[PDB]
Amino acid sequence: FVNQHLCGSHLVEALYLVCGERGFFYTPKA
């Protein structure tokens, strides 16, 4: 498609809504 012109927090916050069902599962942090 075409995307949110956003860094960091604002990107992943938008992915919670825009990606509807599966958000932003990611690499762990220890």
Place this chain on the structure above:
Amino acid sequence: GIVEQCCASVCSLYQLENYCN
């Protein structure tokens, strides 16, 4: 996670997101 790789300049969307693009 991917989010760092286009937080620097304009890019192709493959540098911005992997799953929601």
